[PDB]
């Protein structure tokens, strides 16, 4: 028992939320190039045998509803769960097209006690989004 059991009938779902266009009120400019990421991820996970589902430009409300519905599915025959978020963000926050939503709110649907069919199975969240406005000037090697 040093490795996760990954021989279930299915590797699991890979949900990709690709937000590119946002409402003006947010002041976030179109995330050019995010479609390339979304397609790369889809193909990459497809080869790893995951059931990939791509969703584009979801509002903060739609993201929460999607995560809730997914977490309520029967993941019994799945080895794991993967979710990739591509959007603008801030520390602890991810942006729906119309506004911010706490990451904790999203991941909580999959808590060991709230999604029993995934208890003890690896739940991966891949997050491509800013976590503030600090810039790394780097150092010469």
């Amino acid at each position: 028992d040093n490795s996760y059991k990954m021989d279930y009938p299915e590797m699991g779902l890979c949900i990709i939320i690709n937000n590119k266009n946002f409402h003006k009120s947010t002041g976030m400019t179109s995330r050019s190039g995010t479609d390339v990421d979304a397609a790369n991820l889809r193909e990459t996970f497809r080869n790893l045998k995951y059931e990939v589902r791509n969703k584009n430009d979801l509002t903060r409300e739609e993201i929460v509803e999607l995560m809730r519905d997914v977490s309520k599915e029967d993941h019994s025959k799945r080895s794991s769960f993967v979710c990739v978020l591509l959007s603008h963000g801030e520390e602890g926050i991810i942006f729906g097209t119309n506004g911010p939503v706490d990451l904790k709110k999203i991941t909580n649907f999959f808590r060991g006690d709230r999604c029993r069919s995934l208890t003890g199975k690896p739940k991966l969240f891949i997050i491509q989004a800013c976590r503030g406005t600090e810039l790394d000037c780097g150092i010469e090697t």
Binding site: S3, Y4, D37, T44, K123, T133, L135, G138
Partner: protein, 95 residues
Amino acid sequence: CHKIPVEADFLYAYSTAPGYYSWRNSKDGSWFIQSLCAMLKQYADKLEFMHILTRVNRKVATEFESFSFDATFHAKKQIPCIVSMLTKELYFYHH
């Protein structure tokens, strides 16, 4: 009784460190995502996930640097952030 934390078995692979911006190339995609996909494609059939993500960290840290007409955003770097609450090793393959 035989219980496990409700926060156990989660892995959050952040594209950048806490408080920092995350970089993206308008043409090729985000630094983190293109690196992650390349490393998964090259090593998923062998290496454990944390080691694959460590490779992603290095690729992002060494091969990318921003270029901007705005000196404020020019020549910047980025390091991803692996946050693991996993309790076991993860391999995307089976024997």
